[PDB]
């Protein structure tokens, strides 16, 4: 069903402190290399109030190498598909919620992607636009009730040498019953913004991700 080169497509709707937007992407990837890359365009709701960096985890683990012994949920999920719902947790209080469901149609993924956040101080880095990128991290692969979930605790670098950490908690599952669940496993994985306009109406984002087994 995967091809070497794949398609992407994805629009965001979300809000975040009260801030409505909508996000249109378009982008490229190799799922058996494990790298993606797209370019984004906010459509509503800019400039942005708030750190561009905080969505960009939300803008596809097909998008990851898996060696031939780990099981990989991701690119078994497909055709059909498969969906994840993410939990942001900072060390301030900011709290988001993210979801993607995504699909396949030839040799395109379609993504409908929804960020929800709040309770963000005004005078934080998110919201005064502090950040500077996310440091690469490591996700923790297991099955807690059935369901596959990842949890990463990672940070954002921001100006200043301090970072400003977060953890992350998400569920993954496939649209189809009967597809196996993998053994715990680890994801390294590392996003970067590649170029970005003035206030980051439009913006280039590439991701990297490899599946091991810790050795």
């Not at 709701?45 to 898996?66: E, M, Q, S």
């Not at 031939?68 to 969906?83: A, E, L, M, R, V």
């Amino acid at each position: 069903a995967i091809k070497p080169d794949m398609k992407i497509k994805l629009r965001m709707e979300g809000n975040v402190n009260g801030h409505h937007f909508v996000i249109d992407g378009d982008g490229t990837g190799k799922p058996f290399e494990g790298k993606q890359s797209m370019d984004l365009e906010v459509k509503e709701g800019g400039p942005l109030p708030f750190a561009f960096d905080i969505l960009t985890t939300a803008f596809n683990r097909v998008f990851a190498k898996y060696p031939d012994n780990i099981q990989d949920y991701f690119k078994q999920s497909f055709p059909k598909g498969y969906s994840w719902e993410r939990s942001l947790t900072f060390e301030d209080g900011g709290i988001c919620n993210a979801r993607n469901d995504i699909t396949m149609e030839g040799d395109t993924f379609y993504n409908k992607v929804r960020f929800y956040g709040t309770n963000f101080p005004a005078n934080g880095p998110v919201m005064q636009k502090k950040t500077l990128k996310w440091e690469p991290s490591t996700e923790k692969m297991y099955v807690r009730d059935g369901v596959l979930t990842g949890d990463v605790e990672t940070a954002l670098l921001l100006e200043g040498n301090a970072h400003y950490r977060c953890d992350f908690r998400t569920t993954y599952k496939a649209k189809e019953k009967g597809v196996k669940l993998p053994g715990a496993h680890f994801v390294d994985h590392c996003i970067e913004i590649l170029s970005h306009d003035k206030d980051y109406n439009k913006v280039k984002l590439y991701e990297h991700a490899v599946a091991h087994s810790g050795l």
